[PDB]
Structure 1
Amino acid sequence: TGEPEYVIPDVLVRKHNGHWTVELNSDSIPRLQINQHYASMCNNARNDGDSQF
């Protein structure tokens, strides 16, 4: 009983148009984003204590 365990690659290599090309695995590339709500909350007329934070 049991099952094999796999590993997710980080870079993929394939032969295209007779030459080898290398790309990143898009399923595992980490990415982030800035929350636009709190970012747009930066009002100058608002209290400085919140603005500096």
Structure 2
Amino acid sequence: TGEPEYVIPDVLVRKHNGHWTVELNSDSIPRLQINQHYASMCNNARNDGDSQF
């Protein structure tokens, strides 16, 4: 009983058009963003504490 364990690669190396090419694994590359809704209220009209925060 039991199944083998695997590992997700971070870098992929292939041979395209006779040349060895290297790329990152798009299925595991970390990424982030900026919340536009929260960042749209950075104005001096509101309280200064909110602005500095």
| TM band (smaller chain) | over 0.9
Shift of 1:34: 0.4
SS in 2 for 1:27: coil
SS in 2 for 1:3: coil
Shift of 1:11: 0.3
- Please give the TM-score of this superposition, normalised by the length of structure 1: 0.96
Structure 1 outlier segments of 4+, above 6 Å: none
Shift of 1:43: 1.8
- For structure 2, the residue ranges without an aligned partner over 5 or more in a row are none
Q: CA RMSD in A?
A: 0.5
SS in 2 for 1:51: helix
- For structure 1, the residue ranges without an aligned partner over 5 or more in a row are none
Shift of 1:6: 0.2
Counting aligned pairs with the same residue, the percent is 100
- Please give the TM-score of this superposition, normalised by the length of structure 2: 0.96
Separation of aligned partners in 2, 1:16 and 1:42: 48
